[PDB]
């Protein structure tokens, strides 16, 4: 049970919210890699998926698949979720709307030709309009570093990686909002961020359309 | 407030997991209808949502907004969360699993006619095939009346519900199940089960795609 294992394809999808809270928290993992259809029938085969689909993560002798469940349960073994059932609220109400603003930012690049640029424009209007105040309005509120309970928790995490995904879909989102430029900022500086940006860790890039029309036709799954 | 307060329009959707729940623990709550556009403007313009969405409660002095929000903190301050972070893993992983079933027969509905057929087959084929054994085998794998602890938690209530959702979909589809259909007779039976389960309570009916296309009509909601 030394480090937890984590199992997907090489590229960020569901999988990358995992490794920036195991990141953030300091804790080494190991990646196995889902290069080919074989690799991810043998482990659907094999027992290791519960609903055989990944993320799934190797962690304390458990087979654990699910996003959610995986972070959920990462996020309280490393006290990264809040200190009682009021803050355990925000945080979720918190990181939901964050996996929300993921998705519809993501999701944009499997979308048919002939829809994508509306797709693209209610995904832009959204983020400016819905979620970017949203998290601006929660830090002004309060004043404070963090997002709860005035500490780190998983969705300062969760949040300075969806605002990188802002920034590379639309650069021009986030000038409006002083707080959350400070706030990714400050998170950025923390030790085991700033590591985790740096180049050569196992932070993963975009991939293109190219490589995404590639791999996506490799395994075939609907 | 004593009584929560449930946000939504008349109707299942997403905020029927948690109906449920409550009704579970025998916890008595009101609900406000979302019955036209001007209700929801007001919801917005008034400060009620976060992220301008329902499902929204009132409870505990919060307006929690997210469903998975609202689910976890629910079940928490019901002891129907399980006793510890491994048991929480197994509840979050099976839980998860069941919503993206509902999901995937839910969508259904929504599939214009040229893609309904084929959207259908996928979802029988990924019912009786990936979801229903998965809890099956739950079930055979301890023997035991609950899902998970020996004890009622969030997500036997989570199986029950969806069960009943695939049994309308197509009821052959249990019955290679037995032990899915011993579960399914066992939880209805639980007192306040039964209360939610007949006439009167404020449980939901299902709705027909022309009972979708008209009120998804009037709210132009993108
Ligand atoms: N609610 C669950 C969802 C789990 C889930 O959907 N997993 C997917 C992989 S992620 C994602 C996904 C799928 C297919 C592929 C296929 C090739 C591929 C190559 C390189 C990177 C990714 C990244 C993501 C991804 C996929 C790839 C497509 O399944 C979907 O589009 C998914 O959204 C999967 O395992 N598919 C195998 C299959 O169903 O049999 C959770 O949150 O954990
Ligand atoms: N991750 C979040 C998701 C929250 C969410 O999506 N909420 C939706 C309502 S549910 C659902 C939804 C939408 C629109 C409508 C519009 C009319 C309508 C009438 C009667 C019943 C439902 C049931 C669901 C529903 C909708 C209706 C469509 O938004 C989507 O299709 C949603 O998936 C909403 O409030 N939309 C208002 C808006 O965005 O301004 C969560 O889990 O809580």
């Not at 993501?106 to 797709?119: H, I, M, N, T, Y």
Request: with cysteine.
């Amino acid at each position: 049970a030394g480090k937890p294992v984590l199992h997907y394809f090489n590229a960020r999808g569901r999988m990358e919210c995992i490794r920036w809270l195991l990141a953030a928290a300091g804790v080494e993992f190991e990646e196995k890699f889902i290069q080919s259809p074989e690799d991810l029938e043998k482990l659907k085969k094999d027992g290791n998926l519960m609903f055989d689909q990944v993320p799934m993560v190797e962690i304390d002798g458990m087979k654990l698949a699910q996003t959610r469940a995986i972070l959920n349960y990462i996020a309280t073994k490393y006290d990264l979720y809040g200190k009682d059932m009021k803050e355990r609220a925000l945080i979720d109400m918190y990181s939901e709307g964050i996996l929300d603003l993921t998705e519809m930012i993501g999701q944009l690049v499997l979308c048919p030709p002939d829809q994508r640029e509306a797709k693209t424009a209610l995904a832009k209007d959204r983020t400016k309009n819905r979620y970017l105040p949203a998290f601006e309005k929660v830090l002004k509120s309060h004043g404070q570093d963090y997002l709860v309970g005035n500490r780190l928790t998983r969705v300062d995490i969760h949040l300075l990686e969806v605002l990188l995904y802002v920034e590379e879909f639309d650069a021009s989102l986030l000038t409006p909002f002083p707080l959350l430029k400070a706030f990714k900022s400050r998170i950025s500086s923390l030790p085991n961020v700033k590591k985790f940006l740096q180049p050569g860790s196992q932070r993963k890039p975009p991939m293109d359309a190219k490589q995404i029309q590639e791999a996506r036709k490799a395994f075939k799954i609907q």
